[PDB]
Design a protein around this ligand. Structure first.
Ligand SMILES: CCCCCCCCC/C=C\CCCCC(=O)O[C@@H](COC(=O)CCCCCC/C=C/CCCCCCCCC)COP(=O)(O)OC[C@H](O)CO
Lengths: 218, 504
């Protein structure tokens, strides 16, 4: 136990990590059977976003169109908080792109986006961000107060998260408030991520088909 | 063997001679006391179901003690809990909580305790049977060990569950909880009772009732206790309750203990102490008075110095200092003791990076108060307040073209313009403020939509305009147009100041 009942519900709506990670890699594998590294990544992000909408089978398109990018960032950030080694980066497929490569190939804008995600991952590892809080933030990001049953789910998840962290991280007087402050940082990074990808689209760099742009354009 | 014993007593537990069923029961309670037989019982639905139903509708004390005791014994096994659950025993146990006899209460509450802890669905079940009311009512009992299990049950039911909380509130839970903290010294009980209060204090309906029940003063008694875990529930709870306590009296001891804890070896005790003090001194003049009297100002400056760049500490501490230096009988001695205690330079240092906006907002507000005292007018200038204050102002004004790190940049415009408004009471300061080429901004600020920004902008131009060249400089900037249109404004402050500027 030691986990409020709501947080136990939400944890039961989580996807199988090692399953969807092989499904996604086994999709990109047969995709090259060309397109660029940026095209691979667009395809991957595309797939990740499919997992995310699937996952959103729990407690619709007006919401998803709000946070799709915030969810994609938050997912990526949590992967680095958990599995993240220093100097490199882990993708939903398992690959380990070193920051040497990021700084060598990629340009200024994307390098800045990575820097911001690392300020966040640092911050969250420092807070000891854990799975229970992770899933809470998902729902707080999905069920935005910026788009009825929303205020509802927001009040409830807030309550549960506040109790969970007060009781499980007593030595951190400030944790609840700290986590919540990452939410507007995630949004700011997601705004810069949309704009960067929008420019890649205007320049023909994005693959003919991809869910990201559909969402962006709506 | 046992498998043959069971189906027998099952049939006797359903007989119609209360002496038979009574003897059936004394029988089974003995059997459950042994490993093997007990296993046979919880493997027998008919039997378990029969035991519950007998305990439910009976009126013999003896059969009640033996059925309750039996469920207590099955409740030590995962499959025992499961049998009691499926068999509807939770509602019957909640009924036993009504019992006068103390052996039954013990059995019922412990069984309920193991259910709540290790059996899924039990919490919802215990709530639906009205278990909360019963448990709150049992709080006037006097067996402290018993009270320990009861409060622990309330905590399990209360945790992360706003519904249940509101229920405990409505049963008089707060007053009963606070009374336990005022009465007993059993660390385990006080610890379990303080978790319930902790959990309850985050609820906005419960918070006022706990405060009303003398909760803060009661928690105050336990802050020096040897038990670190007890002391941390008390600080957590005190911190949550303290934004809602400007009412209370009898606070002298608590405030006193709070100041002493500022010196704790424990960085966390220290952090909460500042936060609660910040909270209790906010817009409450009698607390400002009492904290100042036991050397609060001295203790808070020591704390800011000790914390260095640790903002979890300096931010609550600065906040308290801001409360302590305004609007009370001893506000003036305090604006001075901050300087006298080698606090000025560090307060101004905190305006610079690595500080974040929450600390910066607090510090800006403290500096505004410190400036009210003329003897700080010079020290604050020597330390570089003004260039930094202006730098932050133009930075937050430009960023108005939402909530950056929790802080609206429109709060940094106002606070900065306000700190300058007070600093400008000194001619040397006015020369510096003019120098930084501020006038065009203050005039631009007159058009700000926020009434409070107009006010401070009109306030600083007013203090500047007491000097001829300044007064003219302001004219030459297109001030006379917006200024006049402000003469007719809702709030007095903007009106009066606007008039005073025009005056020159
Ligand atoms: C971590 C923050 C996200 C950054 C990209 C955000 C928006 C884009 C979403 C879809 C595709 C991801 C793009 C990643 C970089 C890209 O695949 O490959 C780059 C090189 O590859 C190597 O550096 C090595 C490979 C590096 C892999 C990147 C790891 C992160 C991918 C998943 C992150 C979550 C999904 C994002 C959701 C946001 C909404 C679209 C090409 O760099 P370039 O565009 O020329 O910079 C030029 C510049 O910014 C011109 O001036």
């Amino acid at each position: 136990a030691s986990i409020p009942h709501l947080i136990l519900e939400l944890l039961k709506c989580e996807p199988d990590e090692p399953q969807v990670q092989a499904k996604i890699m086994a999709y990109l594998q047969q995709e090259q059977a060309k397109l660029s590294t940026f095209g691979l990544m667009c395809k991957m992000a595309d797939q990740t976003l499919f997992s995310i909408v699937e996952w959103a089978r729990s407690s619709q398109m007006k919401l998803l169109q709000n946070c799709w990018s915030e969810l994609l960032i938050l997912d990526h950030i949590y992967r680095q908080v958990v599995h993240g080694k220093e100097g490199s980066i882990f993708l939903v497929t398992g690959q380990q792109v070193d920051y040497s490569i990021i700084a060598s190939q990629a340009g200024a804008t994307l390098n800045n986006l990575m820097s911001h995600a690392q300020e966040l991952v640092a911050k969250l590892r420092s807070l000891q961000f854990d799975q229970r809080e992770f899933v809470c933030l998902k729902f707080l990001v999905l069920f935005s107060l910026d788009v009825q049953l929303v205020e509802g789910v927001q009040e409830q998840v807030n309550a549960a998260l506040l109790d969970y962290t007060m009781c499980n991280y007593p030595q951190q007087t400030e944790k609840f408030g700290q986590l919540l402050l990452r939410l507007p940082e995630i949004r700011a990074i997601s705004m810069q991520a949309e704009e960067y990808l929008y420019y890649k689209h205007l320049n023909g760099d994005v693959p003919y088909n991809n869910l990201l742009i559909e969402m962006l354009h709506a | 063997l046992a498998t043959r014993a069971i189906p027998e007593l099952t049939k006797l537990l359903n007989d119609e001679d209360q002496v038979v069923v009574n003897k059936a029961a004394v029988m089974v309670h003995q059997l459950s006391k042994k490993e093997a037989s007990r296993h046979a019982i919880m493997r027998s639905p008919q039997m378990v179901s029969a035991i519950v139903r007998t305990m439910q509708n009976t009126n013999d004390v003896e059969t009640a003690r033996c059925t309750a005791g039996t469920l207590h014994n099955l409740s030590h096994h995962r499959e025992g809990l499961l049998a009691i659950f499926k068999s509807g025993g939770i509602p019957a146990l909640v009924k036993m909580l009504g019992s006068p006899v103390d052996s039954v209460l013990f059995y019922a509450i412990t069984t309920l305790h193991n259910l709540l802890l290790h059996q899924e669905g039990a919490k919802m079940a215990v709530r639906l049977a009205g278990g909360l009311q019963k448990m709150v009512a049992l709080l006037n009992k006097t067996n402290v060990k018993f009270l320990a299990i009861t409060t622990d049950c309330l905590q399990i039911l209360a945790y992360g569950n706003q519904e249940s909380k509101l229920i405990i509130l409505a049963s008089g839970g707060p007053q009963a909880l606070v009374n336990i903290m005022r009465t007993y010294t059993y660390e385990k009980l006080l610890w379990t009772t303080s978790r319930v209060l902790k959990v309850l204090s985050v609820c906005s309906s419960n918070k006022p009732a706990i405060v009303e029940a003398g909760g803060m003063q009661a928690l105050g008694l336990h802050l020096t206790d040897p038990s670190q875990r007890l002391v941390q529930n008390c600080l957590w709870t005190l911190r949550n309750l303290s934004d809602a306590a400007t009412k209370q009296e009898g606070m002298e001891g608590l405030l006193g203990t709070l100041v002493q804890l500022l010196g704790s070896d424990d960085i966390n005790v220290v952090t909460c102490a500042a936060g609660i003090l910040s909270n209790l001194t906010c817009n409450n003049y009698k607390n400002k008075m009492m904290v100042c009297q036991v050397g609060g100002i001295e203790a808070l400056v020591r704390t800011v110095l000790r914390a260095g760049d640790r903002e979890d500490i300096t931010e609550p501490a600065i906040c308290a200092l801001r409360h302590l230096t305004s609007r009370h009988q001893e506000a003036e001695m305090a604006q001075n003791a901050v300087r006298l205690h080698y606090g000025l330079p560090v307060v101004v240092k905190l305006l610079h990076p690595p500080s974040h906006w929450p600390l910066i907002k607090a510090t800006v507000g403290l500096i505004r108060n410190l400036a009210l005292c003329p003897a700080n007018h010079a020290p604050l200038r020597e330390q570089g307040a003004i260039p930094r204050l202006v730098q932050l102002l133009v930075r937050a004004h430009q960023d108005t073209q939402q909530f950056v790190e929790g802080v609206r940049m429109e709060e940094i415009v106002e606070g900065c313009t306000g700190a300058l408004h007070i600093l400008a009471r000194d001619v040397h300061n006015r020369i510096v403020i003019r120098g930084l080429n501020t006038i065009p901004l203050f005039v631009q600020l007159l058009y700000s939509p926020i009434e409070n920004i107009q006010r401070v902008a009109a306030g600083v131009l007013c203090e500047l305009a007491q000097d001829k060249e300044a007064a003219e400089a302001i004219e030459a900037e297109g001030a006379t147009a917006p200024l006049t249109e402000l003469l007719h404004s809702r709030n007095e402050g903007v009106a009066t100041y606007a008039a005073a500027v025009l005056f020159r």
